[PDB]
Amino acid sequence: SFVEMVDNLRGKSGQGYYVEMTVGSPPQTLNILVDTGSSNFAVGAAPHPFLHRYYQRQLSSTYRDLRKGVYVPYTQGAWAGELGTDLVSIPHGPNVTVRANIAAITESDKFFINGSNWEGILGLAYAEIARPDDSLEPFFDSLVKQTHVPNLFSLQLCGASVGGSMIIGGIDHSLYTGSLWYTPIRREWYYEVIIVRVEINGQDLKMDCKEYNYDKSIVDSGTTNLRLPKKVFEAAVKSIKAASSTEKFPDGFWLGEQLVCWQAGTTPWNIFPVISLYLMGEVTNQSFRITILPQQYLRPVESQDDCYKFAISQSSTGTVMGAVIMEGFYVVFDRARKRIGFAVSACHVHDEFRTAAVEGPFVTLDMEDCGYNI
């Protein structure tokens, strides 16, 4: 029944995934990066060297100025702009139109990307982390409040020109194989989850699970990498190196400071290990695990040479399950039931020998203690 929403995402590898959104009246359609890691809907609204088009408020009869500025800082970049509301539809999304808050971006720093094809960002997380404060209703909240659309969306991010699907209001079964396994949303701010165990090629990293979630773990479609707290990152690299020891790589490769390239079509995927994260399940003492391949964590950087960047990196703000994780899976953001589902993606990049996996149940004790508290 959701067929018209299939293949509604596009992107360039490593530059996020975007969906078309139509704003204002008469219609102004823009490409909008989908970000489960923030909660502001914002669009370029003035010329920028990296923008080929932008929102023109004076041409929208339905634009309402909120007479208030807004600023959002991200990990490296930031933008400043002006708040208002306008009519918004997603032409390859649900068949509704809502009046939503929109931040019109007038200035920015290291936000837009040269040649990315996107012109704005759709923050799909919860009001608690919206700027300027939690009173600025996020887009998805407006969608659910104003319409019949069920309080759920799902993302199938298909890695490498990338594509995928954002199904809004439900789940499409053509997008995954096997079973969906759910982890609780710990708290409605970011999409926060609890990681309870980590394995490299089946070998337990053997760290206290409190390290994996210090100070939070989140599912973030607007971040390319799998980002890990420093102690966890260091242990993971040590283990990944040991597992791939038949080949030698410079220290800088593991730090993302050096690329390694193979002649077209010869990448020895088989010499790199799979990586598993166990997540808290829906039943007491029950967990499940998601497993990704080097096809997910070694990312192509665009001749006759295939160059790759190691896309697991260090974080000082907790674990971030970015595209590196999401590209293996169909991920269901079941806001109505405060849970996130994972299943093997029908589109994920793999080979004849290994596939990404979602497996369970396992027995894991004292999972509640894994989470960070202030």
Partner: peptide, 7 residues
């Protein structure tokens, strides 16, 4: 790459 909220 992209590295989307500060915090």
């Amino acid at each position: 790459x992209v590295q989307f909220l500060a915090x």
